Amino acid sequence: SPECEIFLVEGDDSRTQAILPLRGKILNVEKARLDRILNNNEIRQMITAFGTGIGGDFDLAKARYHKIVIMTDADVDGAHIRTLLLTFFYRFMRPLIEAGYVYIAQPLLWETTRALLQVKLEDAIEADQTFEMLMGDVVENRRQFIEDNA
Amino acid sequence: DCSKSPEECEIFLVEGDSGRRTQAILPLRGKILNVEKARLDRILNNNEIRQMITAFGTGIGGDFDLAKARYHKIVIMTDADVDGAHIRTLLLTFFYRFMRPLIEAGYVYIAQPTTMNPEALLQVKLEDAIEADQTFEMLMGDVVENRRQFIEDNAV
Amino acid sequence: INERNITSEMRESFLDYAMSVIVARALPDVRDGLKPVHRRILYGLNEQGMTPDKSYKKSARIVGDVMGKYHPHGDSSIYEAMVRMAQDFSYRYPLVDGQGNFGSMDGDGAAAMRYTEARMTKITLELLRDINKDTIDFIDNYDGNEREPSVLPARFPNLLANGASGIAVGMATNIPPHNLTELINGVLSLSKNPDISIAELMEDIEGPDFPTAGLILGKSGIRRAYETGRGSIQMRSRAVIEERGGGRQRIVVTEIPFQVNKARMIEKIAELVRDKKIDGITDLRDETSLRTGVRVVIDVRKDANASVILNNLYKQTPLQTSFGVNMIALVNGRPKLINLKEALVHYLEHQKTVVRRRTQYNLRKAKDRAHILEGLRIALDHIDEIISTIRESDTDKVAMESLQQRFKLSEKQAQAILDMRLRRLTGLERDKIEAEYNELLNYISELETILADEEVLLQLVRDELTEIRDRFGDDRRTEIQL
Amino acid sequence: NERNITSEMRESFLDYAMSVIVARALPDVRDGLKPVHRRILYGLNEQGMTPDKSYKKSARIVGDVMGKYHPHGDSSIYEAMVRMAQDFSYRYPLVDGQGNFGSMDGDGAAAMRYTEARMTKITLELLRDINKDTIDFIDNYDGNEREPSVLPARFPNLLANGASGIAVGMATNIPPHNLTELINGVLSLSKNPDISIAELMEDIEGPDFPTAGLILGKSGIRRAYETGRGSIQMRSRAVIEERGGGRQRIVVTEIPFQVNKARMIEKIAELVRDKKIDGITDLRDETSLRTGVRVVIDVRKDANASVILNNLYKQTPLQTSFGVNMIALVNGRPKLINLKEALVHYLEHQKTVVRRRTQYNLRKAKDRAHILEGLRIALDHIDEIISTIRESDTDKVAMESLQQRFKLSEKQAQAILDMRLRRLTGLERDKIEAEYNELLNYISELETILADEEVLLQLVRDELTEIRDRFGDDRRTEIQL
DNA sequence: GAGAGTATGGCCATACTCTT
DNA sequence: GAGAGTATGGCCATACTCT
Ligand SMILES: N[C@H]1CCN(c2cc3c(cc2F)n2ccnc2c(=O)n3C2CC2)C1
Ligand SMILES: N[C@H]1CCN(c2cc3c(cc2F)n2ccnc2c(=O)n3C2CC2)C1
Ligand SMILES: N[C@H]1CCN(c2cc3c(cc2F)n2ccnc2c(=O)n3C2CC2)C1
Ligand SMILES: [Mn+2]
Ligand SMILES: [Mn+2]
């Protein structure tokens, strides 16, 4: 029964727990066009793992897992990978986050995953504005944000 | 690969490890297959063996042709250590079993310990067909006991 | 001619490699039980001061140190060797303490050196104990810049304790691991009576003791191995037939054979049920956890005989496997097939020699110090004249000569007087020097006794071995049936 | 027990971005080093791997840096170390390597196992005076070790070797420069703070790339120095050689900075195959250690080699632009700086380093003098000193008695107790006095430097001149009119 | 049938910014 | 364009002997 769980892990529960390792930095879907996105092997592995499909063909019912956990390193690059993965979720599988199936693990493994935080999306408009600014193509917006918070 | 005559053309087999037109380089990563121990299907499936056959482009065994030779000089350049020696023996086994005529034609050389710059290579020459056949079988063959005996008699 | 004979090249090149793989790669030393790569890893940890008390160090730093300093080979070779010494299922008495994924019984290797960390174990200290007391010989490393141990002091019998498994050229070696308590007891027995029989040694050493436990079938195989240095020992998994109500049955496997890949064994049994090679199984499960240890559960079909099916598995899968003993070790730097007694005799001699050398070293130091103290004693008794002698002298060379000629003292003693600090002139310091000298005289006598009488030296070896047995020796894990 | 998506994005992004800016991709204005480089250099220095001693295996250097200072992948550390060893990459290389460290053809260096390395003679000048309280030390990632926040950098490394980093929000691209020219400009600036960029340019003519070549015009450079941003045209050194029967050839002896030689050749070859360029008969690379770079292109009998050569500049990386973008870390924040600002900040680093070293030497000198004054007292009254000690039961007692009787301090009494009997000889007695007399003179010199700021500034000038004379060399890149 | 353990290193993708 | 340079590591084959 999917009512099992999958862990996305950056660096190095048999019945109910699944593990998918992600070597390297994930592609930024906000910067890339669809043909590139769909050809990325790490992206394709993730799509297949969930089996919900992307964009319009998304089916919440056809989800393999009700708990998807982003377990990344406790360093700065961990954070970056975290942002990249959330970008993919927001742009291609938004209803999953709305269904509350996505989680972020806090403290790189047995004693850890345990603390998991639910990813919740409150504002559609704010998030859209945030994603485009942080992950988008326009450099200057990103620089300004750094400036003001630096 | 090389930058027309095979006479001027020389190829270097290197165990991985600057300053070279005819000179060609083929690097061999890892230990080479022992052809004395292996059957034909395994031999031909070895990537490193296949690369060498293609490089020379003379064919093997029955179909071997001296005229087809891409390079007139073949140099075994391996590391100056114990494993270098082992790779050297393995490569010579392949030549003796599959391209005997090349050694007879004196196209094979061994580089000794800046050497590539012409500003020494030793010729491999085959004096006795019978002794070599006996020696190869004893050193590279399947019977372990013969190999042991050789070590015992010549040790240290 | 600038030409080389093909037969001459083959013979020379082959021999170079074969000899090197034999005396410096694949075969362990009889005295310390270590192949060159292992010795270098252990010594490298010791030299970098990575001990059980201090924290774990990054594997890339250990490997890089060993590579630069002692082992001129690929990093992956050094790391993989270090990993095995850290594995509880591989080493009966592990020599490396690791942090992170160091692999498991399922064949899965350790995480890359970048993600792993390590330090030496408490027992490894006993291999290195007294290394700096001229107990063993040091040779130059590959480049000449460093020095390294030719062998380690090895205060416990490591070759038999942890065993050996190496493939050379012309030969190979396969020595099973043993219980430390049993070994030391056998060693003490042998020291008492040099003409002890292998039968008599077997009263102490019952057989091999594998870290993975399990069961050895019969003592007949073990006897041949110990007497001749060669033989075959049957190893079978610990499996029990568990009963459920209405005659329902299951097989549970709690221990497996040594060096047997758990994952591969499972896949082979699965292959037999798929291929209809074995009939009577409903489900095969692996419930192995860190808490429970190894747990392999096989559920039997109703009204099928579990005893019969279990026995088929021994005959068909690595649930029963043989260990083929082949005891070749390096003895006087040449390979040799040795029996159990020869192994024990050589190790005992190493201990005798190590202890002799340590005692001789301590004596040279003690005597040197005493000689120095005798001079200092003279100076403190005649301080006023000593001081005047120095002050009257224009240079240190002059004072040295004058101190020697006047107070009938040696060059070493005169040097020591010049180097003396003014604080040594106090009451306490004068009494301290005397108390050191009195104690030192007593100690030199103790050392001299050990070196004179061979029985005293032999007793000291016994005493030290006993201490190791008491501190590190543990229960026998492998059961010998019948 | 829930996390907002907008809150995670903003927090996580900023954490990474700021880290990549202030501790990965951008160099410091004072020493011109990104964190990985500083750690490699300091690690060489701590392990004692200097030019005089032998080459050490790369796996040992990398492993040391990783364990001690840089908690990142071994390949990142090694690749950084490699670039500092490459003569085509660094105008003044900071690492001396043995084995294959790559070439101009884009060929990577062989794996860490097959290479070995040590620091260069110039690198010593970056580390000079590090142990004299000249720079600040911080704790490393785990707390077990301490590491330099910046290096003393006795030569102006940021401009000398340049920088090329891609951050987040921003990036940096600083070209390399001639050291003689730089120092001359530095001395010029120190004499007169009101100097113009035009006036600085009389000393510093422009960038000097290790790969030589040519810069087309002063126009792009001037904008770059004045504003900190500019595009500079770099063209290969080519000659049209005239042969028998009207046949011609083009010969290329220098290529642009950061341009892959092999890839350039492949680009020309693609143009002849695809018929996008007409006239070329044969393309050869005769590059050797004796000749340096030698690329020969044979022109057809009919073809005007001038025309073809000009087409090649327009079509291939035979002519390439360098886009200057001078962002460095100034007070630990990123800042776009012009040429004068770069020189001003480096000069201040030197002034501060020299001042701090002088203050350190003074503390030591005074400590030693104070000690010597005590030792002088003891030698004058030795007989009483000796009796005072002998009468005392413990060292604590002798200390107290020596202080109370001969008006000595605790440090002076300690030193007297620690005195070795050999100090009582004629030469040694005279040595102590002669050290004291010299030390008094030296303290005055140090005191002068600290009182007058002009004396301190002159000292900086003098030391920079010495570096210029020892390490400075000829300009390689020609700037064309 | 295999696989026990020391030896002999390339090849792959992505983030991020800037550009005749 | 694509590539300038620090960051985030697994996958491949062979020798050699022995039941
Ligand atoms: N399918 C792709 C995804 C990850 N990957 C990869 C990983 C590399 C590298 C080079 C790579 F191609 N690579 C090249 C140099 N260093 C590394 C390195 O550390 N890594 C590891 C950390 C991710 C292959
Ligand atoms: N699944 C394991 C069980 C034993 N086995 C095996 C055994 C071999 C061999 C080759 C083998 F693969 N093998 C190959 C050549 N000679 C032998 C040989 O003597 N034996 C020993 C058992 C008799 C693989
Ligand atoms: N020709 C290529 C394909 C086979 N090969 C190879 C090489 C390895 C490895 C594992 C390998 F598969 N390998 C695995 C672990 N260490 C090594 C290793 O050092 N090497 C290098 C020295 C030979 C080299
Ligand atoms: Mn990490
Ligand atoms: Mn080698």
Numbering used by the authors:
A (entry chain D): 425 to 427, 429 to 437, 448 to 542, 583, 591 to 595, 601 to 637
B (entry chain B): 420 to 422, 424 to 437, 445 to 447, 450 to 542, 594 to 599, 602 to 638
C (entry chain A): 9 to 490
D (entry chain C): 10 to 490
From the paper:
DNA gyrase, which consists of two subunits, GyrA and GyrB, forming an A2B2 complex in the active enzyme, wraps a positive turn of DNA around itself before the strand-passage event, thereby introducing negative supercoils. Type II topoisomerases are essential for transcription and genome segregation in bacterial cells and are the target of a successful family of antibiotics: the fluoroquinolones (FQs). Imidazopyrazinones (IPYs) are a new class of compounds that target bacterial topoisomerases as a basis for their antibacterial activity.
To gain insight into the poisoning mechanism of the IPYs, we solved crystal structures of DNA–cleavage complexes formed between the S. aureus GyrB27-A56 (GKdel) fusion truncate (19,2829) and a 200 bp DNA duplex and compounds t1 and t3. The IPYs, such as t1, lack the metal-coordinating keto-acid groups of FQs and therefore cannot form a water–metal–ion bridge. Instead, t1 contacts the protein through a direct hydrogen bond with SaS84 on GyrA (equivalent to EcS83—the initial in italics denotes the species numbering for residues, Ec: E. coli, Sa: S. aureus), see Figure 2C and D. The arginine positioned next to the catalytic tyrosine (R122) contacts the keto group of t1/t3 in four of the six binding sites observed (four in the t1 complex and two in the t3 complex asymmetric units). The distal nitrogen of the aminopyrrolidine group in t1 has been modeled contacting the main-chain carbonyl of arginine 458 in some, but not all, subunits. The EcD87A mutant enzyme did not show any resistance to the IPY compounds (IC50 of 0.49 μM). These results are consistent with the observed binding mode of t1 in S. aureus DNA gyrase, in which t1 makes a direct interaction with SaS84 (EcS83) while no direct contact is observed between the IPY and SaE88 (EcD87). The orientation adopted by the tricyclic IPY t1 was also similar to that adopted by FQs despite lacking the keto-carboxylic moiety that allows the FQ to directly contact DNA gyrase through a water-Mg2+ ion bridge. In the IPY structures and all previously published S. aureus complexes with DNA, the WHD and TOPRIM domains within a subunit have been in approximately the same orientation ((29) and Supplementary Figure S5F).
